[PDB]
Specification:
Substrate binds at residues 45, 54. There is one protein chain. α5 links the parallel β5 (122-128) and β6 (156-159). By secondary structure, this protein is α/β, with parallel strands linked by helices. Helix content is 44%, strand content 19%. It has a single domain (1-165), classed as Alpha-Beta Plaits, CATH 3.30.70. The chain has a 6-stranded mixed beta sheet with strand order 1-3-4-2-5-6, with helices on both faces.
Length: 165
């Protein structure tokens, strides 16, 4: 019942992605990715301990599951990072999902071991699958979108957009 054990291990990412890209290419349905970063997680983790960090990760993971469908995939990608794969969600539906997740985490109230308010936020990079055969390319451009979100000040969603150049 620990929500964290629900998370998929990244070792399954390529297989799942290659399968969903294959499917998206034949049916022409949308496919998209959220790469999610818990803001200042490393800072919080050694300022309040590893037990606090785990609770953040539980609150954050619960937010993901409350906003996606059984057809979607939720990965633990790194220490502070997650990847959500959405299937058959339009660009707008994808952005709305990301925002529901982002707002939900921002509004979440959490206290440390000693009762102090720990402010929580997420940075999110979103990108739509555009037919490119490599799943690594879809993850790369979402990662570019996420780098933009962090550099713009965190607690936000960015959608990867092709340069008008």
């Amino acid at each position: 019942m620990d929500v964290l054990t629900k998370l998929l291990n990244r070792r399954f990412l390529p297989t799942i992605f290659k399968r969903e890209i294959a499917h998206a290419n034949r049916t022409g349905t949308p496919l998209s990715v959220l790469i999610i970063d818990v803001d200042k997680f490393k800072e919080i983790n050694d300022t309040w301990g590893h037990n606090t960090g785990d609770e953040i990760l539980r609150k954050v993971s619960q937010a993901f599951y409350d906003n996606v469908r059984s057809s979607d995939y939720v990965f633990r990608y790194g220490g502070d990072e997650f990847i959500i794969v959405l299937t058959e969600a339009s660009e707008n539906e994808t952005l709305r999902t990301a925002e529901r997740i982002r707002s939900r985490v921002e509004k979440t109230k959490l206290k440390a071991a000693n009762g102090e308010d720990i402010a929580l936020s997420l940075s999110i990079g979103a990108a739509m699958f555009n037919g490119h055969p490599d799943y690594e390319r879809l993850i790369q451009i979402a990662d570019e979108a996420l780098y933009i979100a962090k550099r713009r000040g965190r607690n936000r969603v960015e959608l990867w957009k092709a340069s008008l150049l």
